Amino acid sequence: MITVLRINHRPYRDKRITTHVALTARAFGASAILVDERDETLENTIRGVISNFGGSFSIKTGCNWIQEFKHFQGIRVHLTMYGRRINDVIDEIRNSGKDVMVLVGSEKVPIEAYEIADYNVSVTNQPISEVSALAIFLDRYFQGKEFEF
Amino acid sequence: MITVLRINHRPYRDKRITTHVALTARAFGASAILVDERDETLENTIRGVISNFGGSFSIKTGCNWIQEFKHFQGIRVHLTMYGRRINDVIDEIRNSGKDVMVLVGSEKVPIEAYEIADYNVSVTNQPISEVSALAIFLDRYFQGKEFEFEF
Numbered sequence: 001m002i003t004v005l006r007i008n009h010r011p012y013r014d015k016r017i018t019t020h021v022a023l024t025a026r027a028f029g030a031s032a033i034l035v036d037e038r039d040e041t042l043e044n045t046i047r048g049v050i051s052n053f054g055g056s057f058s059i060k061t062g063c064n065w066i067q068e069f070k071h072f073q074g075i076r077v078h079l080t081m082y083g084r085r086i087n088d089v090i091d092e093i094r095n096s097g098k099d100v101m102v103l104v105g106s107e108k109v110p111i112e113a114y115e116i117a118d119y120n121v122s123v124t125n126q127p128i129s130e131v132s133a134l135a136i137f138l139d140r141y142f143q144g145k146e147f148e149f
Numbered sequence: 150m151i152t153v154l155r156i157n158h159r160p161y162r163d164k165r166i167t168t169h170v171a172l173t174a175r176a177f178g179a180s181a182i183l184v185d186e187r188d189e190t191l192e193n194t195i196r197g198v199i200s201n202f203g204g205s206f207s208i209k210t211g212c213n214w215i216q217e218f219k220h221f222q223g224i225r226v227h228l229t230m231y232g233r234r235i236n237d238v239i240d241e242i243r244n245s246g247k248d249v250m251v252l253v254g255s256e257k258v259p260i261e262a263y264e265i266a267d268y269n270v271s272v273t274n275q276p277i278s279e280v281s282a283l284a285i286f287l288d289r290y291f292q293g294k295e296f297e298f299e300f
Contacts, residue, residue, distance in 0.1 A: 017165055020278035027275040053275055085296075124296045126176035127198055129169035135281035136288065149275060
């Protein structure tokens with residue numbers, strides 16, 4: 001099972017982008033998303049989608065991201081421009097058979113995430129969207145396989 | 150060459166999602182993006198990226214999307230969840246040797262997008278971000294090689 005941990009969500013600014021992260025996570029085969037800042041309106045939006053389009057994807061908000069990432073029972077993946085290329089490590093991640101937590105949304109020089117993660121993974125050295133980074137990570141993990149709701 | 154056509158840009162509502170679309174278009178190997186509503190902030194942002202990171206990508210805004218799509222000289226692709234499975238059609242599109250214009254919308258897209266397109270293309274039947282739809286479209290078009298492209 002893959003869980004996305006989305007940090008740096010600002011309820012009063014980032015509803016759209018965080019929504020886009022959650023829908024991408026769901027569509028491309030993650031089972032859950034955890035969001036740092038509590039956002040009941042986001043929960044209601046996403047839970048609405050899940051109701052309307054099916055399946056058991058989970059959203060929780062108001063999470064302590066360092067604790068969730070630190071104590072996750074499985075592989076901790078940090079999506080970041082400061083990371084090695086996904087292709088270098090994706091097979092080993094996939095072949096591990098473990099649950100995976102993928103951290104999206106880190107900023108600054110992301111020390112606390114780098115202190116915790118098992119893998120720090122980039123797609124390109126060009127500026128990209130975290131939404132597109134998450135899509136590519138999930139696509140590579142699931143090897144381009146399609147999903148059934 | 151791939152040109153992205155981004156519609157339903159509403160610059161006084163949000164510029165982040167369209168900026169993310171443009172950054173994705175550029176990084177994933179499109180040559181150009183055309184955006185329906187004029188947005189000089191967007192133009193300058195993306196031109197700033199080109200200045201610092203290289204390559205020859207172009208952005209224009211304030212475009213009549215129906216006219217651009219209808220009269221584009223090449224294959225008109227519309228990315229939509231209500232389209233055909235991408236893997237059914239991506240090979241024909243790639244092997245045509247034609248230029249491609251890829252329409253990416255937001256909220257509801259006008260029915261004309263579906264009627265004009267040569268191919269209405271679904272990366273998934275589930276609601277997703279236009280950013281991730283575009284990423285996967287380009288990724289499949291370029292068969293995973295686009296991150297080797299030089300800027």
